[PDB]
Structures are given as structure tokens and as C-alpha cells.
Amino acid sequence: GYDYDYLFKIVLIGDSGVGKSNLLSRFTTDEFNIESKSTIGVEFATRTIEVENKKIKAQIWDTAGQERYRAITSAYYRGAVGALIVYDISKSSSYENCNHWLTELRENADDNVAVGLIGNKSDLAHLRAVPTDEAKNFAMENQMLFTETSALNSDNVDKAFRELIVAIFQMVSKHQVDLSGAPKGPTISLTPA
Amino acid sequence: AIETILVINKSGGLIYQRNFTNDEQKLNSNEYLILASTLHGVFAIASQLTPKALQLTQQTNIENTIPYIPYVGMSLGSFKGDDFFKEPFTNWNKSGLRQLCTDQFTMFIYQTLTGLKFVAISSSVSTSNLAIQIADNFLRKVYCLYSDYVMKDPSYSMEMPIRSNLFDEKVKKMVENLQ
Amino acid sequence: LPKVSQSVYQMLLNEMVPLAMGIERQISRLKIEEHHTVDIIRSHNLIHELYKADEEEKEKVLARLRNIGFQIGLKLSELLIFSNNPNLKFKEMDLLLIMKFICRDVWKQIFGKQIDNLKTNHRGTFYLLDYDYRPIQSFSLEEDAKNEELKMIEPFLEIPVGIIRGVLSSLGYSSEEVICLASFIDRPTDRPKTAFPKGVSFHVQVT
Amino acid sequence: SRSLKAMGEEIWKNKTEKINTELFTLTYGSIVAQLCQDYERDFNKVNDHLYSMGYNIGCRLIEDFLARTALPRCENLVKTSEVLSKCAFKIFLNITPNITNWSHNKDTFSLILDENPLADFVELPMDAMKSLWYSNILCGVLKGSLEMVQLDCDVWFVSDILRGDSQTEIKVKLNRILKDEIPIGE
Amino acid sequence: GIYSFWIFDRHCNCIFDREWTLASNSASGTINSKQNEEDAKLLYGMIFSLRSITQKLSKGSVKNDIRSISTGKYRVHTYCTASGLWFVLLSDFKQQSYTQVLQYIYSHIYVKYVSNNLLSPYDFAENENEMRGQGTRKITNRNFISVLESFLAPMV
Ligand SMILES: *C(=O)CCCCCCCCCCCCCCC
């Protein structure tokens, strides 16, 4: 099924315990090698979407470094053309670490990478600790898209992810043209003697 | 009998998965992306697991050179002559995953200096050291062929899937010769 | 003649001290068979428990294990007499012949090696000396905890005492005129050093 | 490499120390007799303690069995039956139990002990004629070993020649093949 | 000869560590040292990941297991048993494979001095809370370490 024209690499990075694993429960093909997070450091999900009549495959790398991954986690951003920074609006530490994560991405990831901001567990309004205004203001200064996601408020992260892939495709897509009455009959020799 | 060849562009992710087994088709396209990305990650892990004894003292820059086989390739494009190279060449990935041994197949990995990765799975299980030389020579053969017919292609974005017609058939002929 | 693997037999024979503690605790890890739950307690925990439970508890467990060894020896003696047919008489010609029979036959059949030399005071007690004592050749705790080793293998040394006591029974002298005690006082005198450092001595007295 | 049976006689012939069967009978009989004596002859759940013994010893014995044979992990029960019929019993007790009574969907089966070296010559009393099994240790070892191969299976006794039935049977029904464990880090 | 020796169990927990040094037999043998706890979990991650890759693309009806894994400098010799007990070994190339050596270790050191060593435990994850990689109850049997060092002394 090697029909997809382009293969984009996206990294789903965020603070430990934020709930990334539940965040990428939707935009997946829920099969294949499960877990493997603690083994090498990443778990893999894929999505297929058509943009401008061209199939695109997006590979999602939900890396995390607990105690062992110092250099490998850095190497895993070798050519990521997308990033999906995650924080929970429950504790200000996760939102505070977003600048540190963005610094690592822009220092190590691919040049002019399209990176966004996701606010997970927004249904729990009881223990909110980061307002939407501050998150949006932080997104404005750093050229990022921002949204808030929840289990009850699902189908928003899917649209944000498709929109991020569309933003990437408008940047790393070289323009092309669709390249798609021949003579018939018996010929006669005309080469010189 | 190299039954499968796959290549990983520069940062994980699969761009070519032509296989030459008779009929297995057990793994769909989706799982092979996971396989390639896992191979890249395991390569990264293997880089950072050198024993302490060799980290501070290598003294082994004579064995990295790969002796050349006469006609491992076949029996060209930008190249010319009876073979792609007659001289012996050097190893680049002196601190990375190099093969995987299994009783039913043997995987060989050849990493370009730039970052291109070429993986060959062979059903054959050689003293487990000469086969490294055979695999490296064949994979540099395939890398030269890729540099000919995939890099000199106007309609091919960098580090994207290799949807070409000359490259795949020529590597098919090349692996057909080697058995 | 039929045979059984020595490994499984030795594993069963070692599995009496965990029996001896577990059954005594039952008189005094949850798990299901098919519909009813049964408690299973790990074997190695019971040796620790037997080491550090009580003096009277330990005495009861040791007596029970001695009874097991007594039954083994009592049943085994008749078959050995039927098969090998030694030159012994019923009650007593001399104790030296009886102990020679035990050393030459019983330990050959139970363990894989003939028991080593034996002392003789010629009137009272006999000492049977065994080097490296097969059924505990792979028994250890720790590099440093060496003194604990001797004190916490001690219950395992009762089954051969029971075997000797039983073999003495059904051969004349009963289990009132015979007292037997095992100990670790033996040295590895000059033989090559094995896994276990200490030997075994069986101080058996009859009258 | 070779068939399971051929591996069985090859290992049994010249790759194992041996001990007389009669001594094994005496030792196990002494164990069961002392259990009967000290537990007030309440035969209802003396069997449970023998089962616990079997579990405990089998958990160690599986290590020896796999170290000797070095077989791959068993996936389906058609192959597990072959294994524990034609090599596992052969190495230890030198017997070859037969396999019959394949349940539907290949879920369960039964081991028929043509000879039981654990109970070679025993005559139970009338009290134990329909209360005691006397070979519970064997099924205890079977499951204690099979647990360590990552597959759970309830095993029990259907009949025994000692009690007076035609043949001794051991149903070894499965419950679930529990999956391997993976590390977790959060 | 060799560089280091590792033993894992069914419970994804490293059970034994032995690190070697320059070819002197009495090397810096830090046994079960906390300083190598970091570079054991990722080794287990390597072995588990490549084992999963091997099983996924396997064919036939045997469910093959990985034999050895060679990097540029060293190579890994691995032996996995049905009971879930992996014997890994880091070593320079020098020779084809260590399958006989690892089998001998399993069948004459571990099985003899741990499984048949009722004093010591088995399945070292006890009563939950360390069954899944988070724990340390590594073996410190006198006979195991002594005999193992004696056996690997010639090869180094
Ligand atoms: C897949 O590997 C299945 C392996 C077969 C199970 C192991 C059975 C070993 C125990 C057999 C019984 C031995 C006799 C015990 C009586 C004391």
C-alpha cells in the first residue's frame, strides 16, 4: 500500500504525566506494536490524509525522557517537520516547561518547523491553573497554533492535527505539473551508405 | 539470498520496501514503517552502549577497512567499467548497529556518512565476519545505484518515498545476480 | 531394573524442611484450584521462618522431620536386607558390622557416594564422618553471612539422622537405647574444596 | 533438530544420573504417610498440601527441564501435549503417558498413566477408598511448571487406579495464556 | 574475550551484573553495582525491541529467537529460555558465537546454584510492586559468583 506521496515526521512531546498517551488515542490506526515506550523511548502512530489531491502519510513520534534518554531523545528530532507540544491545564509546571521544550525543538529539530500547542484535560475545570489568555499570548510570540482538548470535547484535536499537516504541506511541497499522435507505419532506411 | 531490502532516509521513516521473496506478503506497508523507525531508534540506543574499556582506548583503526570482493555485484549509469569499484573502502558507522543474527534470517545495516541507511535481510544464516564484507559491498553497490537513479531525478523531493521505475528494477536485477 | 532421575529425587528429598515447617504451621499467596481458594507459601520463606520462629516450634519441627527420616529408614531396611542380604544377625553380634553395613549399602543407595571413614571407641559411641554431603552441595546465603549459614542449614541435617535411627530399628535395637546427633564440627581436612565449606558428622550412641 | 521422542530417549540414555524407583516410592510414601498421621487423617484437604508441594517443586523443576532440553516456548496445546507426553515425563520418571479425550476446540485433554511410579505398590484403607488421590503431587508439578512457561491451566485428577477406577487420568484444562510483561515508566 | 555479563528474568528486572576491564583476570569486577543500573534497562530495551522485531517478521512455525547482535565495536551474545530468563554477554568478536558457553552457564551454574538453592529465592519480584522493571533484588549467592568468576576467568 505504498501510495502515499509524502512522509512527514511529527513529534508529540510534552511533560511526563501530562496525558500524551490518551491524547493520541484518536488519530491512530489502533493496531501494531503496542507499548515499546519504555524500551526505546517512542511509540508510533500513523495517519493518512489527502491534501490538494495528494496522499500524505504522517508519522507521530511520542518521545519521552524519564531517566535514561539524554542523547537519544535529542537524536529523535533529527528531521521532524512537525511538533505537537502538549501541556495540561491543571498544574502550571507543565505549561512552564513549554518554553524549554520549544527551545529544544527549535535548537535541534528541522529548520522552520511547524509546531503547535495542545491543552489536554480541559474537561476538568475544577483544578484549572493556566488560563486560555496566557496560553494564547505565549503562542502569539512564538508562531504557534493553540487549542484545548478533552475526552468530552473530542474531534477538536483531529481538526487541529489535520490543520497542522496542511500548514506543513504548504511549506515543504515543491510545485509540480501533471505530466501525463505518435507516428505509425512502416519506415524506410535513409542512413547514408 | 537477500530476500528484502529497505532504506531509511535520514531521520527514521521508510522510503523504499521492495522485497524479492516468492510469496509471503505477511507484513502490510504500515508495519514496515514501524520496523524502520524502531531500527533507527535501536541504532541510537546501540551507539550509547559501548563498554567502558573501549571508550577511552580504541587502537583499532586498521580493521575498519572493508576488503573488496571482485564481482559481487552482477554477472551502468554515471559509473563506467565492469564494476562500481575495485578498491577497498572504509567503514563509517564504527559505533552503531551493524547486523542482527537470527537462526532464520540475518539483517545487515550499512549507514552512509550523510545519514542514509540501507538494510538488507537475507534468509541465509561464512564465518559471520566475511558475510559482513559481502553485505557491505552489496549495500554500497545499492547505494551507488541509488545515488545514480534517485538523486538525479527532478521529480523527487528529498527524504521522501522513492517512487521511481529505473532504480527498483535495477536493484532487482542486482539482487537477482547475487544468490 | 527400573530407574528414576536423581535430580527430581534429590529435589523431593530436600523438600522436607519446608514441609516440616508448613504442616506444623497449618496445624497451629492466595490461589484457586478450580473453585476454592488455597493458600500457598513459598518454600524459601519457610526456611527463614524455621530459623527465626521459636525454640519449641523448632523442636517440634525437628522431631517431625526425624520421624519422616525414621519411616524412610525403617521401610528401606527390609528391602536392602532382601536384596543385598548382609551377614548380620538379629540383635547384636557387634555394632561394627551393623555400622559397616549401613555405610556400605544404605548411603550407596540413598546418596551417590559411599560415606567416608568412621571412628570407633569400641565400647560406646560411633562417629560417621561424611565429606561434602551431597543434598546441600548448592546451599548458600551471602558472601558475608557465613555464620548464619551453619545455623540455618541445621534442620536439613535431621533426615539422615532419622534414616540411621530407622535402620538401627528393625535390626535389633529400638529407638530408646539409641541416641544420634548430627553436627557441622567436621573440617575439610585435605580433600579438594567443594561448594559447601563444612562437612557432616553423625554422632550415634547405642547401649 | 530432531523429534521430541528421539530427544527423549537420547537424553534419558546417557545424559542423566539415576536412582532406584523403589527408593522414590519409599520416600514419597513416607511423606504421604506422615502427612496422614499428623493431620488427623482428615483426607479432604491433605490433598491441598500435596498440591502445594507439587507447585513448589515444579517451579524449580521447570528450570532443570528447560536447561536440559532447551526447547522453545510452547504456544499451542497440541505441541505442549507432545512435549509433556514424550520428553518431560521421560526425562524424570521414565514413563510415556498417553493422550486421549481431546475436548472441543482443542481446549483440554487428559494424561493416562499406564504406570505410576509414585504409587507403584500401595493399598489405601477403606477410609481413603474414595477421599484420597495419593498422586496429587504430580498434577501440582505439572501446573507449577506450566505457570513458569507463561500459560495458566487448571489441572486435577479424574480417576485413579488406586481408588479402584479403570485407569488413572489427569485433565489439564487451560484457563488463559497470560501475555509477557513490558516495562512501564511514567 | 568478554566485557560484561547480564541476567534478566521474566519480570523485566535485571538480576545480575558483572563488568570487566583490561585483560587481567582480577579486573574491576563491580558486581551488582548501582552505577550500571542506568546502562542495563536500555540494554534490556534493545534486546526486547529487536526480539519483537524478529518475532513480528518471522515465518514458519517455530517463533525464532535472536542469537547475536553486533555493533561496530563490540557484539552482543544473547540466549533466551522458555522460562523468561535472558543471558546477555558483551564481547569483542574473536570467534563465531557463545551459544555453547551461555548454555553451559545456564545448565551448570544458574540451574545448580540458584534454582536448586532453596535458601535463595526464585522469581525475585516478590508480592507485586516490582514485577515490572522497578526493583533490585539481585543474586548474591557465594557459590554462584565464585563458580561464575572461575568459569569466565580463562575467557577475557
Ligand atoms: C512448553 O515448554 C511446555 C513444557 C512442558 C511442561 C514441563 C513439565 C515438567 C514436569 C513433568 C513432571 C515430572 C515428574 C514430577 C513428579 C515428582
Question: How far is residue A35's CA from residue A41's CA, in Å, rounded to a whole number?
Answer: 10
Cβ neighbours, 10 Å, residue A93: 14
| A30: exposed, middle or buried (Cβ count in 10 Å: 0-12, 13-18, 19+) | exposed
A13, HSE (Cβ side, Cα atoms, 13 Å): 25
Determine how β-strand E14-19 pairs with β-strand E4-9. antiparallel
C-alpha distances in angstroms, C140 versus C62, C145, C150, C187? 21, 9, 10, 18
Q: What resolution in angstroms does the PDB record give?
A: 3.7
Question: How far is residue A144's CA from residue A137's CA, in Å, rounded to a whole number?
Answer: 10
CA dihedral B136, B139, B145, B148 (to 10 degrees): -70
Q: Which of E42, E53, E60 is opposite residue B35, by nearest beta carbon? A: E53
Say how many Å lie between the CA of residue C155 and the centre of ligand 1.
Answer: 29
Which of C31, C47, C50 is CA-nearest to residue C39?
Answer: C31
| A49: exposed, middle or buried (Cβ count in 10 Å: 0-12, 13-18, 19+) | middle
DSSP characters over A84-138:
EEEEETT-HHHHHHHHHHHHHHHHHS-TT-EEEEEEE--S--TT--S-HHHHHHH
- Residue A18 annotated in ligand binding: yes
Question: How far is residue A104's CA from residue A187's CA, in Å, rounded to a whole number?
Answer: 67
Beta carbon of D55 within 6 Å of any ligand 1 atom = no
- In three-state secondary structure terms, A58 is strand
Determine how β-strand A55-61 pairs with β-strand A6-11. parallel
Question: How far is residue C115's CA from residue C111's CA, in Å, rounded to a whole number?
Answer: 9
Beta carbon of D61 within 6 Å of any ligand 1 atom = yes
Determine how β-strand A82-88 pairs with β-strand A114-120. parallel
CA dihedral A137, A141, A142, A145 (to 10 degrees): 40
Which of D173, D168, D113, D167 is CA-nearest to residue D143?
Answer: D173
Say how many Å lie between the CA of residue D38 and the centre of ligand 1.
Answer: 30
Q: Which of E60, E90, E93 is opposite residue B129, by nearest beta carbon? A: E93
Total CB pairs under 8 A between chain B and E: 93
- In three-state secondary structure terms, A69 is coil
Cβ neighbours, 10 Å, residue B71: 9
SS (H, E, C) chain E: CCCEEEEEECCCCEEEEEECCCCCCCCCCCECCHHHCHHHHHHHHHHHHHHHHHHHCCCCCCCCCEEEEEECCCEEEEEECCCCEEEEEEECCCCCCCHHHHHHHHHHHHHHHHHCCCCCCCCCCCCCCCCCCCCCCCCCCHHHHHHHHHHHCCCC
Q: Which residue has the cell 527390609?
A: C78
| Alpha carbon of residue C92 to chain centroid | 24
Report if residue B83 sits inside a domain: no
Tell me whether residues E121 and C14 touch, CB distance under 8 A: no
Question: Which residues form the domain of B119?
Answer: 1-49+91-179
Which of A1, C100, C61, A30 is CA-nearest to residue B17?
Answer: A1
DSSP characters over D95-146:
---EEE---GGG---EEE-SS-GGGSS----STTTTT--S-HHHHHHHHHHH
Chain D positions touching E8 (Cβ under 8 A) are: none
Which of E145, E15, E150, E7 is CA-nearest to residue C141?
Answer: E145
CB D46 within 8 A of CB C22: no
SS (H, E, C) chain B: CEEEEEEECCCCCEEECCECCCCCCCCCHHHHHHHHHHHHHHHHHHHCCCCHHHHCCCCCCCCCEECCCCCCCCCCCCCCCCCCCCCCEECCCCCCEEEEEECCCEEEEEECCCCCEEEEEECCCCCCCHHHHHHHHHHHHHHHHHHHHCCCCCCCCCCCCCCCCHHHHHHHHHHHHCC
Question: Which of left, alpha, beta for C121 (phi over 0: left; psi -120 to 50: alpha)?
Answer: alpha
Chain D positions touching C75 (Cβ under 8 A) are: 26, 29-30
Q: Which residue has the cell 479424574?
A: D158
Question: How far is residue A82's CA from residue A116's CA, in Å, rounded to a whole number?
Answer: 8
Tell me whether residues A16 and D184 touch, CB distance under 8 A: no
Which of A106, A85, A110 is CA-nearest to residue A97?
Answer: A85
Tell me whether residues C14 and E118 touch, CB distance under 8 A: yes
Report if residue B57 sits inside a domain: no
Angle at E73 between CA E70 and CA E79, to 5 degrees: 30
- In three-state secondary structure terms, C120 is strand
Minimum CA–CA partner of E56 in chain A:
A33
C-alpha distances in angstroms, C198 versus C66, C131, D51? 22, 8, 34
Return phi, psi of residue C26, to 5°: -65, -40
Q: Which triple of cell numbers denotes residue B5?
A: 531490502
CB A42 within 8 A of CB A60: no
Chain B positions touching A31 (Cβ under 8 A) are: 30
Angle at A26 between CA A24 and CA A28, to 5 degrees: 75
Break-preceding residues in chain B (C–N over 2.5 Å): 75, 125
Which of E1, E65, E96, E50 is CA-nearest to residue B130?
Answer: E96
User: Could you tell me which residues come within 8 angstroms of residue D28 by beta carbon, excluding any fewer than 6 positions away?
Assistant: C12, D118, D137
**Domain CATH number, residue E47:** 3.30.450.70
Angle at A170 between CA A166 and CA A175, to 5 degrees: 130
**Alpha carbon of A139: minimum distance to chain B alpha carbons (Å):** 27
Angle at B159 between CA B155 and CA B160, to 5 degrees: 55
Q: What is the set of domains in chain D, with CATH numbers?
A: 1-186 (3.30.1380.20)
Q: In what order do the strands lie in the sheet containing D169-171?
A: D98-100, D110-112, D169-171, D156-159
Beta carbon of D99 within 6 Å of any ligand 1 atom = no
Q: Which of E45, E115, E132 is opposite residue D184, by nearest beta carbon? A: E132
Which of A61, A37, E10 is CA-nearest to residue D185?
Answer: A37
Check if A35 contacts D (Cβ < 8 Å). yes
Question: How far is residue C127's CA from residue E49's CA, in Å, rounded to a whole number?
Answer: 60
Cβ neighbours, 10 Å, residue D166: 7
- In three-state secondary structure terms, A175 is coil
Report if residue B96 sits inside a domain: yes
CB D131 within 8 A of CB D50: no
Question: How far is residue D141's CA from residue D144's CA, in Å, rounded to a whole number?
Answer: 5
CB C187 within 8 A of CB C52: no
Mutate to test the interface with B, among E5, E69, E89, E90 (most CBs of B within 10 A): E69
Which of E49, A42, E58 is CA-nearest to residue B97?
Answer: E49
Sign of CA dihedral D10, D13, D18, D20: positive
Tell me whether residues A2 and B45 touch, CB distance under 8 A: no
- Residue A21 annotated in ligand binding: yes
Which of C107, C72, C3, C112 is CA-nearest to residue D20?
Answer: C3
Chain C positions touching E122 (Cβ under 8 A) are: 44
Question: How far is residue A112's CA from residue A5's CA, in Å, rounded to a whole number?
Answer: 21
Check if A47 contacts B (Cβ < 8 Å). no
**One-letter amino acid for residue D182 of the chain:** I
CA-proximal residue: ligand 1, atom 7 (nearest): D145
Name the strand (E) or helix (H) holding A24: none
Q: Which residue has the cell 516468492?
A: B22
Which of B45, B34, B33 is CA-nearest to residue A76?
Answer: B45
User: Could you tell me which residues come within 8 angstroms of residue B15 by beta carbon, excluding any fewer than 6 positions away?
Assistant: A7, B7, B8, B9, B159, B160, B161, B162
Q: Which triple of cell numbers denotes residue C90?
A: 538379629
- Residue A116 annotated in ligand binding: no
Question: How far is residue A20's CA from residue C123's CA, in Å, rounded to a whole number?
Answer: 85
Q: Which triple of cell numbers denotes residue C200?
A: 557432616
Question: How far is residue E89's CA from residue E106's CA, in Å, rounded to a whole number?
Answer: 13
- In three-state secondary structure terms, A170 is coil
Report if residue B179 sits inside a domain: yes
CB A105 within 8 A of CB A83: yes
Question: How far is residue A136's CA from residue A89's CA, in Å, rounded to a whole number?
Answer: 13
User: Could you tell me which residues come within 8 angstroms of residue B165 by beta carbon, excluding any fewer than 6 positions away?
Assistant: none
**Domain CATH number, residue B125:** 3.30.450.70
Cβ neighbours, 10 Å, residue D82: 15
Check if A31 contacts E (Cβ < 8 Å). no
Tell me whether residues E90 and B51 touch, CB distance under 8 A: yes
Tell me whether residues D184 and E84 touch, CB distance under 8 A: no
D131, HSE (Cβ side, Cα atoms, 13 Å): 12
Q: How many residues does chain C have?
A: 207
Beta carbon of E63 within 6 Å of any ligand 1 atom = no
Q: How many residues does chain B have?
A: 179
Which of E61, E65, E89 is CA-nearest to residue B102?
Answer: E65
C88, HSE (Cβ side, Cα atoms, 13 Å): 26
Which of A92, A89, A37, A98 is CA-nearest to residue A68?
Answer: A37
Q: Which residues pair with C157 in a beta bridge?
A: none
Which of B150, B116, B151, B95 is CA-nearest to residue B13?
Answer: B116
Report if residue B71 sits inside a domain: no
Tell me whether residues C140 and E141 touch, CB distance under 8 A: yes
Question: How far is residue C164's CA from residue C77's CA, in Å, rounded to a whole number?
Answer: 10
Helices within C105-188 (DSSP H only): 107-110, 147-153, 158-168
**Radius of gyration over alpha carbons of chain E, in Å?**
15
Q: Which residue has the cell 475526552?
A: A151
Indicate the number of domains in chain E.
1
| Alpha carbon of residue B40 to chain centroid | 13
A106, HSE (Cβ side, Cα atoms, 13 Å): 13
Q: Which residue has the cell 549399602?
A: C105
Report if residue B59 sits inside a domain: no
Question: Which residues form the domain of E5?
Answer: 1-155
Question: How far is residue C133's CA from residue E43's CA, in Å, rounded to a whole number?
Answer: 41
Beta carbon of C8 within 6 Å of any ligand 1 atom = yes
Residue A51 DSSP class: S
CA dihedral B35, B39, B40, B41 (to 10 degrees): 100
Q: Which triple of cell numbers denotes residue E151?
A: 568459569
| Chain C neighbours, 3+ Cβ pairs < 8 A | D, E
**One-letter amino acid for residue A43 of the chain:** E
Break-preceding residues in chain A (C–N over 2.5 Å): 180
Indicate the number of domains in chain B.
1
DSSP characters over D53-82:
HHHHHHHHHHHHHHHHH-PPPP-SHHHHHH
Question: How far is residue A75's CA from residue A65's CA, in Å, rounded to a whole number?
Answer: 12
Return phi, psi of residue C193, to 5°: -75, 130
Which of A160, A142, A144, A14 is CA-nearest to residue A89?
Answer: A14
Question: How far is residue D182's CA from residue D29's CA, in Å, rounded to a whole number?
Answer: 44
Q: Which triple of cell numbers denotes residue B94?
A: 564504527
Residue C184 DSSP class: S
Q: How many residues does chain E have?
A: 156
Beta carbon of D170 within 6 Å of any ligand 1 atom = no
| B31: exposed, middle or buried (Cβ count in 10 Å: 0-12, 13-18, 19+) | middle
Tell me whether residues A78 and B12 touch, CB distance under 8 A: yes
